A paper describes a structure:
Mitochondrial ribosomes (mitoribosomes) synthesize proteins encoded within the mitochondrial genome that are assembled into oxidative phosphorylation complexes. Biogenesis of the mitoribosome requires trans-acting assembly factors that chaperone rRNA folding and guide mito r-protein incorporation. Here we used cryo-electron microscopy to determine nine structures of native yeast and human mitoribosomal small subunit assembly intermediates, illuminating the mechanistic basis for how GTPases are used to control early steps of decoding centre formation, how initial rRNA folding and processing events are mediated, and how mitoribosomal proteins have active roles during assembly. Furthermore, this series of intermediates from two species with divergent mitoribosomal architecture uncovers both conserved principles and species-specific adaptations that govern the maturation of mitoribosomal small subunits in eukaryotes.
Using cryo-EM, we identified six discrete assembly states (A, B, C, D, E and C*) of the human mtSSU through global and focused classification strategies and solved their structures to resolutions ranging from 2.4 to 3 Å. Furthermore, TFB1M initially sequesters h45, preventing h45 from interacting with and stabilizing the mature conformation of h44 until TFB1M methylates two residues in h45 and departs during the transition from state C to state D. As a result, this molecular clamp inhibits the premature folding of decoding centre rRNA elements and forms an assembly checkpoint in which h45 methylation is required for maturation of the decoding centre. Dissociation of NOA1 and TFB1M during assembly progressively generates the binding site for mS38, which in state D locks the relative orientation of h44, h27 and h45 in a near-mature conformation. Furthermore, in states C and D, the rRNA linkers connecting h44 to h45 and h28, which also have direct roles in mRNA decoding during translation, remain flexible due to the presence of the 3′ rRNA-binding assembly factor RBFA, as observed in bacteria. Although we did not observe a bound methyl donor in the enzyme, we did observe methylated target residues in states following dissociation of TFB1M (states D and E). In states A–D, the presence of both of these factors prevents compaction of the 3′ major rRNA domain, splaying rRNA elements and protein modules apart to allow for significant intermodule flexibility.
Author numbering:
A (entry chain 0): 165 to 216
B (entry chain O): 48 to 237
C (entry chain U): 27 to 103
D (entry chain N): 4 to 112
E (entry chain M): 10 to 124
F (entry chain D): 190 to 229, 239 to 430
G (entry chain T): 2 to 165
H (entry chain 0): 6 to 55
RNA sequence: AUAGGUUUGGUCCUAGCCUUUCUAUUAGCUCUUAGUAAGAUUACACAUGCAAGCAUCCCCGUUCCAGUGAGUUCACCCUCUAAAUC
């Protein structure tokens, strides 16, 4: 579900624009893959300690 | 001690006031003493210090029967321009800063009480359209969770972890553990 | 604040930051809550980005903008 | 987006032709005096590429910005000669003129 | 001004006077001072209850959405404020702190009962 | 009551003028001292008289004794009275720029309640005349006699709205911001009305004063301008 | 007094009185006019009275004048596209020239009002900041809110000195 | 503008000296197991790794 | 259907009944004064200026719309019971996006119990004034609107000032606006001060209120005494159209009443003080004959 | 500037200087309370104590914040286009 205020704003905009649909606004999370925090990162992008 | 303290306006309709001032404002004959042709841009703070009057008291302080009260509309009118409706600045009449502040407060109070006439402009409406059909002021359709009494998201509620995960955490944090917390109280304890 | 060239204080050389202890159940519940919250926030952020890009595209190559451009050119001619 | 040169279209008088394929042009703008509130002429010198070397001292020319500067000071090219010095053609009637007098009458055509 | 790296973030800039705080919701470079240069003011927040017993929060929702869509980050207090407004889901730490307070008050009530 | 300063004769009242030999009383007239000078010894006094209702004048009196000079100047002033036309009996009919010898006087008509923001001698003379609202600036040599002469000349040479209406044969209509777009006809010609309108001068060729334009544009910065002062 | 004939021309009010705001296409305006000849009279007045106003409303447009180069006066506008607009102004009054140029190459009042409304949005009345940019500095200036401690001391319970 | 050539020389020299004096993995990631500190820098490792 | 207040017909009759007095409409205001300007004009130019002033007055006298009392806002967006007890004071969230009508602007309240609800009308107006200040409007209700100060205002015959303050302070559909306007109208009717509102934009609303409450007797009598007979006949016609099922309407239809006969029929049918209406009408007719 | 004092035996003109107004620093004398704001003269030299950590090791940060005004048209607009956030 959308957050309460954002859902209310979406519904209000639809009703203002003439749309009378009763379908709930919904956030797609199929494209959001929450990768575990311990997954290996890209070592190629990592830095190196400087010589001192 | 003034006998007009309870009803200050009476003093302005008494014959003593007419003899002293006539029809001119109470500040008409006052003159500030200063060096130069250009006076200081502010008046003295007060003519009365520790219950002692200064040599040249201002028009208000020189008459103890003159009371600055929001009901004494006739007195307050003398310190407001009749053509522009603006309160004179203190150097204009020579009133001290304290009496000027008191006069300004009394004039504002009288205007707020409808006792002193002042210009009220005619203004335009705040909004161009007065419709009240928008959802911001109308009723939004309730969400299914609100109808069912469930939290907006399932993760707002406490779910007891499985025993295996708790044991895994206990192994991960050996020697650095607190007492395990059970489900919290359903309502806020009173 | 200190720069990288400023020496460390001598009263802190033996300082050891002991990690805080962990409540397992609250830890697990908090981890799940963070995962869900970040998922929702990322979805909202992608939608906002899409709206911003759509508004930019409608401002540049929008149908109303193109109609206005053609009308202005015709008026000039 | 079409050029990195600030001044895109400018009109000036040619004041120098001693450089090869380059005309030194004087451009006047109107600048308000902040105190007197009167408009005075402010001058600026521009170098314009003249490939054919058809510019003469004193003629009024139009300069168009180059897509990029071709030299340190050459940022413009000669789009056209608005008024050839002593060889002005009246734009309104299209007839040659010498000052305010017609060399060839409009009625003749 | 050019900062090494950095990003835009929507945060609270503290103004007001001693013992009277007030916050301006501003989108600013993360490296800039707290009350220094900002890109745009996106709202305000008065943390002191007024004569009506209300904490007033003003949010420029259109511009907030625009700057979030432009890649701006959010400070944690702003995430909590937006969760309170209902613009975002409630932040996990609000829920966790509510549960902690519930347990603490339950312990206090149990102490009272034991006494 | 003191005059302009504690030790100054200027601004001090001399009382009503004496009854004249003609048999006329002047109890409604007030006399004010404008200048006292030692003539090398005798005393020369410049005084002004006025009834506060448009009738005013000024005179010089020379005598060995100061009081005799006062009396002579007052009695001669009452017999050389000007009449000053007043717009609504509080201000002048229009702005007046004049130069008498080396003394320049720029006077500006002002709305009601504006007060007398003018040279102190001009304030005294206006009070004698009955003018209550006006602005005045004096430039060049500040010579009291020249100032008085120029002031009286300019005030006596002002054209009223009725005179302008008769001259142009047209309605003189007043526009007030406080009254909105309502046209207030303040004067109409006694004779017939001309049917052709005034030329709509696209840009009039008027002589503007740099001080007024500078004040209007906000470039005037004087610390001495618009200072708070006692009622005048 | 102010120097020169028609000193009103050198006041900001007159300079702002102009009604010609060129479209963004215009870059250069050349004014060829004759110092003598009755048929060019308006053009001379156009140079005398209205060029300052046009330049004031169009600071970035290069305005250039030419004298006694052609038998008749004319105006030429150069546009960014390279198109040239020739306006014959012989026998025309200065007001007529202003109206013509406003009609053919001047922004209409609709565009100007749209621009003004766009400028309005930049100064949001709800924003708090210095008076140079915002109506109010602090929320304490709003009635009903907790006032500034500078003017009204806060209660002892709300002050850290007496909370510590 | 008066050129700043010493800055050019310094940056080039520092780049060369950093490319030629690279610390190796055996030096960077060595550890003193008794104190659990890096000999290269002297910084101690976090407690949770000990 | 029954005519609305904003209908072209009703607006035309109310506009004609209000009148247009340029001196009262553009009375000299007490404010910062500037030196007046002067123009030399012919008769034709003066007439042009007069008609332009008439147009300006017509724009100024535009009647405000008459609106019904707004329904209270009682809507709940969410109930997050987890937040109950975590806060002591409510949070008010106002969406200050500039290009939104104030009646479409989302304003919400998170209460201490955790309920996210929509702000009430009073809270909405207060927040709008806080963040979009309007000249003449105060965030806190001025004390002039207390009924004691309102009696004082009425005693000073400053009803127009009261209505201007009400328009500046309250929304047209708010309860306070309706109550103050109705109280002012009641005072005017009780003390016969209708002329105070003539040539003002509130006269139409006052007439609408009187007609809808069936208390036009005093206004009709005042109009007859002021020889505004056309206004009285138009008032009777407006009463009939607003109440076409009333006894006066059928009486006028049956007796074919036009002009003065309409007033007579109304006085005989649906007048609370029809006797005095008849007396005043008879006196007006007698004076007309004598003149 | 609403101006005023001052040249001469005297008048007028020209012209300087000063007075009246509002700020800031310092000095003399004097000084009760509460709140708020502001706070080395010196790019002269500095005792002493703190001002940068975090983190399952890698990295990241210490290039920020804070300070000063020595030097001084590197600050603003357009074009192009690195690094950084999404
Ligand atoms: S300036 Fe707002 S609290 Fe002080
Ligand atoms: K790290
Ligand atoms: K410096
Ligand atoms: Mg003295
Ligand atoms: Mg001098
Ligand atoms: Mg001497
Ligand atoms: Mg001291
Ligand atoms: Mg990149
Ligand atoms: Zn006093």
């Amino acid at each position: 579900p959308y957050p309460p205020l954002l859902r209310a704003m979406i519904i209000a905009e639809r009703q203002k624009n003439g749309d009378t649909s009763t379908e709930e606004p919904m956030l797609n999370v199929q494209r959001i893959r929450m990768e575990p925090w311990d997954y290996p990162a890209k070592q190629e992008d990592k830095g190196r300690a400087k010589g001192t | 001690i003034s006998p007009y303290k309870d009803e200050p306006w009476k003093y302005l309709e008494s014959e003593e006031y007419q003899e002293r001032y006539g029809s001119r404002p109470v500040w008409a004959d006052y003159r500030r003493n200063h060096k130069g042709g250009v006076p200081p841009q502010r008046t003295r703070k007060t003519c009365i210090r520790r219950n002692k009057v200064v040599g040249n008291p201002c028009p208000i302080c020189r008459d103890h029967k003159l009371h600055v009260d929001f009901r004494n509309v006739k007195l307050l009118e003398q310190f407001v321009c009749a053509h522009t409706g603006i309160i004179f600045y203190a150097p204009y009449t020579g009133v001290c800063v304290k009496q000027h502040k008191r006069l300004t407060q009394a004039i504002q109070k009288a205007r707020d009480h409808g006792l002193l006439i002042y210009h009220i402009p005619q203004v335009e409406p705040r909004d161009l359209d007065f419709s009240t059909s928008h959802g911001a002021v109308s009723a939004t359709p309730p969400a299914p969770t609100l109808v069912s009494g469930d939290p907006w998201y399932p993760w707002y509620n406490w779910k007891q972890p499985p025993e295996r995960e708790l044991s895994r955490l206990r192994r991960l944090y050996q020697g650095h553990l607190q007492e395990e917390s059970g489900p919290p109280p359903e309502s806020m304890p009173k | 604040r200190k720069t990288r060239h400023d020496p460390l204080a001598k009263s802190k050389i033996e300082r050891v930051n002991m990690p805080p202890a962990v409540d397992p159940a609250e830890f697990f519940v908090l981890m799940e809550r963070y995962q869900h919250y970040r998922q929702t926030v990322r979805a909202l952020r992608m939608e906002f980005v899409s709206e911003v890009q759509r508004k930019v595209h409608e401002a540049r190559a929008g149908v109303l903008a193109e109609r206005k451009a053609l009308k202005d050119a015709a008026e000039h001619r | 987006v079409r050029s990195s040169v600030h001044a895109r279209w400018i009109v000036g008088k040619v004041i120098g032709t001693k450089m090869q394929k380059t005309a030194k042009v004087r451009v006047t703008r109107l600048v308000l005096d902040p105190y007197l509130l009167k408009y005075f002429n402010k001058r600026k010198t521009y170098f314009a590429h003249d490939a054919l070397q058809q510019c003469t001292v004193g003629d009024i020319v139009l300069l168009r910005a180059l897509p990029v500067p071709r030299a340190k000071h050459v940022k413009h090219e000669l789009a056209e000669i608005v008024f050839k010095v002593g060889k002005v053609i009246d734009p309104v009637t299209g007839k040659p003129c010498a000052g305010t007098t017609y060399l060839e009458s409009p009625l003749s055509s | 001004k050019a900062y090494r790296g950095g990003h835009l973030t929507i945060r609270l800039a503290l103004g007001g006077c001693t013992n009277r705080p007030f916050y301006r919701i501003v989108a600013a470079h993360n490296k800039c001072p707290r009350d220094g240069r900002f890109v745009e003011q996106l709202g305000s927040y008065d943390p002191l209850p007024n004569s009506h017993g209300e904490k007033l929060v003003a949010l420029n929702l259109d511009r907030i959405r625009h700057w979030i869509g432009c890649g701006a980050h959010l400070s944690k207090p702003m995430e909590k404020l937006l969760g309170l407004a209902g613009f975002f889901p409630l932040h996990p730490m609000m829920i966790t702190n509510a549960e902690r307070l519930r347990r603490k008050r339950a312990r206090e009530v149990l102490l009272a009962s034991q006494k | 009551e003191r005059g302009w300063s504690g030790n100054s004769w200027g601004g001090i009242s001399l009382g009503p003028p004496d009854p004249g030999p003609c048999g006329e009383t002047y109890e409604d007239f007030d006399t004010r001292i404008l200048e006292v000078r030692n003539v090398f010894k005798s005393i020369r006094v410049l005084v002004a008289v006025g009834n506060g209702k448009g009738a005013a004048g000024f005179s010089i009196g020379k005598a060995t004794d100061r009081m005799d000079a006062f009396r002579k100047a007052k009695n001669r002033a009452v017999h050389h009275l000007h009449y000053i036309e007043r717009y609504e009996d509080h201000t002048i009919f229009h702005d007046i720029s004049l130069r008498f010898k080396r003394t320049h006087i720029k006077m500006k008509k002002q709305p009601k309640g504006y007060g007398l923001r003018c040279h102190r001698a001009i304030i005294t003379i206006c009070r004698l005349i009955g003018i209550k609202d006006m602005y005045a600036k004096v430039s060049g040599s500040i010579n009291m006699l020249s100032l008085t002469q120029g002031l009286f000349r300019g005030l006596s040479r002002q054209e009223t709205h009725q005179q302008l209406a008769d001259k142009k044969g047209l309605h003189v209509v007043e526009i007030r911001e406080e009254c909105g777009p309502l046209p207030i006809v303040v004067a109409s010609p006694r004779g017939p009305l001309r049917k052709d309108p005034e030329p709509e001068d696209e840009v009039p060729d008027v002589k503007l004063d740099w001080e007024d334009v500078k004040t209007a544009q906000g470039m005037k910065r004087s610390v001495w301008s618009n200072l708070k002062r006692a009622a005048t | 007094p102010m120097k020169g004939r028609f000193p009103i021309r050198r006041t900001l009010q007159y300079l702002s009185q102009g009604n010609v705001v060129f479209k963004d296409s215009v870059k250069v305006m050349t004014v060829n006019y004759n110092t003598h000849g009755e048929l060019g009279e308006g053009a001379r007045k156009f140079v005398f009275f209205n060029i300052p106003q046009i330049q004031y409303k169009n600071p970035w447009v290069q305005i250039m004048m030419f004298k006694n180069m052609t038998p008749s006066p004319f105006l030429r506008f150069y546009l960014d596209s390279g198109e040239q607009v020739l306006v014959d102004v012989e026998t025309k009054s200065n007001k007529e020239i202003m109206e013509h140029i406003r009609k053919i190459l001047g922004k209409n009042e609709e565009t100007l009002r749209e621009e003004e409304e766009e400028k309005k949005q930049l100064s949001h009345p709800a924003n708090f900041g210095p008076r140079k940019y915002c109506l109010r500095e602090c929320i304490c200036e709003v009635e009903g809110q907790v006032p500034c401690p500078s003017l009204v001391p806060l209660p002892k319970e709300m002050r850290g000195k007496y909370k510590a | 503008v008066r050129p700043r050539l010493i800055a050019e020389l310094a940056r080039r020299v520092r780049a060369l000296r950093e490319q030629l004096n690279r610390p190796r993995d055996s030096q960077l990631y060595a550890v003193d197991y008794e104190t659990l500190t890096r000999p290269f820098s002297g910084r101690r490792l976090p407690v949770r790794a000990w | 259907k029954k005519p609305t207040f904003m209908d072209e017909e009703v607006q035309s009759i109310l506009t004609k009944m209000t009148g247009l007095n340029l001196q009262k409409t553009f009375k000299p205001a007490i404010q910062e004064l500037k030196p007046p300007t002067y123009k030399l004009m012919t008769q034709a130019q003066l007439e042009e200026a007069t008609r332009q002033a008439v147009e300006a007055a017509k724009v100024r006298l535009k009647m405000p719309p008459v609106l019904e009392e707004r329904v209270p806002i009682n809507d709940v967006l969410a109930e997050d019971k987890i937040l109950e007890g975590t806060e002591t004071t409510k949070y008010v969230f106002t969406d200050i996006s500039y290009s939104i009508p104030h009646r479409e602007r989302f304003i919400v309240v998170r209460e201490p119990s955790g309920t996210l609800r929509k702000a009430s009308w009073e809270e909405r107006d207060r927040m709008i004034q806080v963040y979009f200040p309007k000249e003449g409007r105060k965030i806190l209700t001025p004390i002039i609107f207390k009924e004691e100060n309102l009696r004082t205002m009425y005693s000073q015959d400053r009803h127009v000032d009261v209505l201007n303050l009400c328009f500046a302070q309250f929304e047209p559909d708010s309860t306070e606006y309706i109550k103050v306007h109705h109280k002012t109208y009641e005072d005017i009717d009780k003390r016969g001060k209708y002329d105070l509102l003539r040539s003002t934009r509130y006269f139409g609303g006052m007439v609408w209120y009187f007609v809808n409450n069936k208390k036009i007797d005093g206004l009709l009598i005042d109009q007859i005494q002021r020889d505004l007979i056309d206004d009285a006949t138009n008032l009777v016609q407006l009463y009939h159209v607003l109440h076409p099922d009333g006894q006066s309407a059928q009486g006028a239809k049956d007796q074919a009443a036009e002009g003065i006969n309409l007033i007579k029929v109304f006085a005989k049918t649906e007048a609370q003080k029809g006797a005095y209406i008849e007396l005043t009408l008879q006196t007006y007719q007698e004076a007309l004959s004598r003149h």
